[PDB]
Structures are given as C-alpha cells and as structure tokens.
C-alpha cells in the first residue's frame, strides 16, 4: 500500500508523540487539570472537551514553539563533552 516517510520529517513528527511540555512553554498555558507534561496525556484536555476555544488559540503556539525547541535541543550549541 501507500507509505510516505521522509527521514528528516519522520524524526521530528514521530518523536512528538512522546514529548513533555517544558516549563518555558507551561507558562503559556497555566492551571492545567492533568498537570502532566507529556503530550499524549495533555491531548486529553481537548478530548475531554475541557479545552475552550480561548485555550485552543493558546495551545497552537505551545505546540509550534515546542517543535522549534526540540530541533535546537537536538543540535545543542553548548557541548560539555
């Protein structure tokens, strides 16, 4: 069957499954009922219909910023080794 998977994209999108929201991003979405940082458990907020339209617009930035931070965290500008 059909199956598309670019090595560069796969590594970024497949890893977003198990990725906890950093404290830097948590400040954008305060008072979270689950209190969990992993996206898999955080997505439940929208599934439980707890996330209001006003929260939706805020979550968009969080996910986007997280994707960007993950890229830099992989490269690392500071190497102690």
């Amino acid at each position: 069957q059909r199956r598309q998977l670019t090595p560069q994209q796969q590594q970024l999108v497949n890893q977003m499954k198990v990725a906890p929201i950093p404290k830097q991003l948590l400040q954008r979405i305060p008072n979270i009922p689950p209190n969990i940082n992993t996206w898999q458990q955080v997505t439940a907020l929208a599934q439980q219909k707890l996330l209001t339209p006003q929260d939706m617009e805020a979550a968009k930035e969080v996910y986007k910023i997280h994707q960007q931070l993950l890229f830099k965290a992989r490269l690392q500008q500071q190497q102690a080794q």
Binding site: Q1, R2, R3, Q4, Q8, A46, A59, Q67
Partner: protein
C-alpha cells in the same frame, strides 16, 4: 567574523500544519493508510 548561511535545505516552512491541528480532535489513528 562568524560566517554562516541563513538559507537551509530541509528547514523550510511547510504548509502541512493540518497534521498538528488535527491532534486536537484525533489522538491515535486506527489505521495507517498514508
């Protein structure tokens, strides 16, 4: 001075953001026919 190229290759702005906004509706797919 520090010489670097601001133009990248894979680091391009794609318009396939749909897959990221659909996560607010669907979590785990029941099939992978993509």
């Amino acid at each position: 001075s520090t010489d670097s190229t601001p133009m990248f290759e894979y680091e391009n702005l794609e318009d396939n953001s749909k897959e990221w906004t659909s996560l607010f509706d669907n979590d785990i797919p029941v099939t992978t026919d993509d």
